[model samples]
Target chain A: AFTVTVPKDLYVVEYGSNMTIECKFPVEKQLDLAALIVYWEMEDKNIIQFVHGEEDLKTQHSSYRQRARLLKDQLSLGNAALQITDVKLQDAGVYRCMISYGGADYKRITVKVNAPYAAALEHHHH
Target chain B: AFTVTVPKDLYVVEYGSNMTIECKFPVEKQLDLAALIVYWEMEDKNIIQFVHGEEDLKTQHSSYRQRARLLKDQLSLGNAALQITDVKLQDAGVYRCMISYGGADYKRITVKVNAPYAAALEHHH
Candidate 1:
């Protein structure tokens, strides 16, 4: 494992608000921002990923297509924080923020996103 | 994070058999057989927990009442493996094994459980 840290491991955010799942881990040394792989996932699905300093929205899950953003500016300092917008009930689950260098240095933090619109959403679906 | 390792970060266990989510991490030192916290959870719900050397089942989720067990003997050697039996279709999810020393030095590995009996059970219903 490399080195990753989430200051807040658990978070509860309401609908229509922005969310930042903090991932502030470390690496072997201070390297180039383009030399890292940052992947964010929710319930085993791709939320967004910052690979070589590019947020590839084209490859993101349709559910999070326009809703997820990677804090690209903070990548140089080894921070893999993910910013989520328009929080939804279906977005509630374990989120993994992984920062990898290659095969040796790997670190991750699992944060749970609990949406407050859960009850009303179920009734709407019903 | 402390120092924890799940040798098998990925597992595919069958149904009707015993499945173990391996949690073989390490602490600062081989302090004691009793001063540690072993928590096993699936989808953020408690499966079973080991605290101070005692296994407390009352706090477990009702769905896993008769299906989960902690590897008590391995705890002394810095292992917090969770054994789950009679795997059901719903038993598939992310499993987390966390070892904590209060404020700092926390470690955990996420293991995804994929059950073979998933589709059949879904069709039966």
Candidate 2:
């Protein structure tokens, strides 16, 4: 059975920034992009799903419809990273990624979104 | 009659960083810091309080014991800003500041803490 893995268990992303939760799943053989099945879920929300040979945007959560994308080209290399643009504070949570290529495997990644702009606020005296 | 005012309604601070919720109040005359009374609360938590002219750290929440401080010098100018060091995610909420100098007045300030470092992630790959 193939296994799924992540580059790291936790990802610290900046607020309102783009982030890619790095994920890797073993593909025993060359897989067709259209044949790949992937699901990205956080909590109970379906962040994004890629099936039927293309992204099923309609099935994703409203908050992530346009902000999330799974790199189809990267899947050819066993990279199932889910990219999220304009990440919000609410996006800071554990994410689950499931891939159906050779054998089904899933992994979870925790995200921490922060805004560290307070360093700039320290200089102003008034 | 003294009034309470904030520099802004909302403050955005970095994670693990320090932040000061700027606030101002009316001081009809030069008042002794020891006689001034102030309270800072978020939700139901007593973030920090000033009574008996000194910081009542014992009455503050454990999470803000050493991390929270009210500038005694700024109070001379009617600046009642509360400084918080090493801000955390839990610190992102509406803060209430109450002051008792001559008359009593209070104001609310909203806080938004974020880590916007994803711009660097965009450059890596």
Candidate 3:
């Protein structure tokens, strides 16, 4: 069993903003990222690919297209941080950082995307 | 998200005792158990095979030899309960119930084993 550690909390923009969640591995094991696959699942369902090694970005689910980004430099150092843009309310939940190597390793983080302040202010003014 | 519900607590004997942890899946998805692979990990460090389909049982790790069992009848009903015998303190920590289907699904449960009361009382006496 591989150990995966992640940040305790994260902040995201409401409805159309971006948020990043960071994860780290304690082992010095090098991941064959080119052949390695990484994915994020919301509350254990609805999985989306945030990165595909050095190849083309693939999105099997529409909810995550143009919304998930991987920082390549950080990944080499075992930093599996995920940047999610254009956030939505449905995106709010526990996101798991999963990696398949000899077997599978995972870590989870909670994301909270808030509503835009202007929208709230406008509603109040009305 | 596929929901995996499990008991919040379970009891196991010190050494040479059998313990069972129950896991329930909310989805009606039919799992090809014959192709499904299940394993157990201690402290998220080492993985040992507990059961594999209706065929052969494989043990990739030595610690789990003659200690793990899967109740097949219950599993068919979506009950992924794991039975561990001859419990040890090292067996403590989180055990995840994982399933790989259209994608992957998992549920986690914590197990605790206590030292035999006789051993504790005798040592103190």
Candidate 4:
């Protein structure tokens, strides 16, 4: 049986900020780099997919072209966190990290993007 | 100038559950029921509007007709919390509570809905 875990299931991010969806899995010994496959997704869109210890962008969605990336070096240590730069309001949603080692397992993280209109508009009121 | 305050600026709610968006204002003494006006809105949509101590649904958007309501009895105490029943995924967004007393003021709150597909699907996998 395969199992996956998320350090934090919920996250509140500021609009136009950076966020990382942290997920982890168990890998006892030197992980079989060739058999490692981790995929990141949001709703119905594909973010990134890794195979053989490297990013395989063949299936990467256009919306996340330059904004998403997986920490390549950390995979060996069982880290499958996906980083998104310049998070937008549309980026507020649930994201899942699918792992494929002996069998398939995944974990989900919810993201909330806060754009504080009060901060900017509060000054205008006076 | 009137001022509005939100005790909690961020909230995470479970899908299909009830939630409250708490908002407050300062009232020196007994609130003047006839002078109080509070309105709730979300992403260009009107939720509810209260005037002269009673709800005026003439401007409420159809989407929130039955699911949204103000705590009518709690208004005199400065409790402007809006209770939402049977919260849906579409309810997850930024909500602003506008207060109209001597002057107009408002506060914003962000709501995130969590539908844990993991809980139901984990058993199948």
Candidate 5:
């Protein structure tokens, strides 16, 4: 059996900024990137495709098709990193990393978004 | 109107450990902790109540009622922090930080959980 680990229970990323997801898996199994489906959805089940994979499996939502990417080369090293560019508040929510291998397994990563100005104002005014 | 900020697209935490949620809101309005409800749910909509506010609104599921806490003092300073003790693999998923003031508004925070041993093995093995 293998495992994965990530830091922090939640992430706070500002909109319009670069975001990186760090996932470390334990097993050395050949991960079929083709079978992986990484998605970001809201509480209502509306999804924002982050990274699907190469070939037919790589389908992304029209709104984020071009904004999401997967570092395929890094996967061999146990990095399931998903990167997003120019984020928005709508991008906020709990993202589940579902990896279907051997059987089926998943991990949950929570993403929080903030406005740059609001963050600063909240800091100084408090 | 107010705004909140979170980092990255996701977060990964291990089971049986401490997890801290960091949220920064923009507005300077007085937050009535007495009326806030913070909960965590699974893909199937099975919710694990994390933290509610003080008094009557503060409630939790039997499995996690005692494991969650809200740093009320932090809220006064624009910090909406929810702390969880001892995590589990089933604890992975998207978390929403909802704040209802004059109206109900929320921010989504995704939380991913992985095994510590698996993380290390995947790192060097």
Candidate 6:
């Protein structure tokens, strides 16, 4: 029996910046990380998926096809962090993670994106 | 007899960065930049507004309270640029800028924000 933990529940990021969201499952010992099914999604869009052994990029959502990648090396320890590059505001939303081991399990997190220029544009001066 | 122009129909930027959206009304000669009313909004909520020769912060939206600002001096040339700081994803959308003198007129543009870090984590390697 195992449970997933996504420590960084609230993710705040600046525009044009890259970041990796971390996710790991707690277990008594290392399991066959390479012999299981893994899936992730943002909102309702398919971000990426791993079945048996290889990744199925063809099935990933177009907007996230190139932006989202799975950290394969960390899989040995139940790491399911998602790395996103050139992230778009359209991608801002809750991400869901799932693993089908003993029983189907799930986890989620929220992401907020922002820009950084300043000045208010209002005038009644004539 | 004038119109506003925002040449850049689209603006894109990274998170935590700043950029200015330009808005200037064209005229044969400079009008009393001091004698006009200007306003701006994102989606449907008010991003900011200028009236009666002053900026009314109390009327601004909370999320944009500290993040939105107007280039006062630039107004001298009919410029009503909006400066946004620490832009938020929620702010990504069509922004409308309006001006009223002889008649009321407006202009709009789209803005997109992004993230750049990498490494897709999938445990079933």
Q: Poorest 10 consecutive residues of model 5 chain B by lDDT?
A: B48-57
Clash pairs, model 4 backbone: none
Quick one: best lDDT, which candidate? 4
Q: Residue-wise lDDT of candidate 6 within A50-78, one digit each (tens)? A: 66555668658888868888888777777
Tens-digit lDDT track for model 4 on B42-62? 866779877766787887888
Q: What Cα-based lDDT does every candidate model obtain?
A: 0.65, 0.75, 0.60, 0.78, 0.55, 0.71
Query: What is residue A119's positional error in candidate 5, in angstroms?
Result: 12
Q: For candidate 6 chain A, which ten residues in a row score worst on lDDT?
A: A117-126
The digit string of per-residue lDDT tens for model 1 on B16-49 reads: 6678777765655665644465667787577886
Which CAPRI category fits model 6? incorrect
Q: Which ten residues in a row have the lowest lDDT in candidate 2 chain A?
A: A117-126
Scored by lDDT, model 2 comes in at 0.75
TM-scores of all predicted structures: 0.48, 0.45, 0.46, 0.47, 0.41, 0.45
In model 4, what lDDT does residue B80 have? 91
Model 3 chain A: lowest-lDDT 10 consecutive positions: A50-59
lDDT of 3 by residue, B1-125 (tens): 33456666454456557787876764366655644444445544334443246523453356766676667667667776777876766676777666432233456666765767775565455
| Model 3: colliding residue pairs | A1-B45, A45-B1
Tens-place lDDT digits, model 6, residues B13-113: 77678879988786456666454667787865677777657876765788898889998778877788899998765667888786654444466788987
Prediction 3 global C-alpha lDDT: 0.60
**Stretches > 4 Å off in candidate 6:** A1-126, B27-34, B117-125
lDDT of 4 at A117: 88
Find the candidate with the highest TM-score and give its number: 1
Q: What are the runs in model 5 whose C-alpha is more than 4 Å off?
A: A29-59, A117-126, B1-125
In model 4, state the lDDT of residue B106.
59
Model 5 C-alpha lDDT per residue in residues B42-123, reported as the tens digit of each score:
3444233322354222334455556666676777776667777877665677666644332223456778777778654654
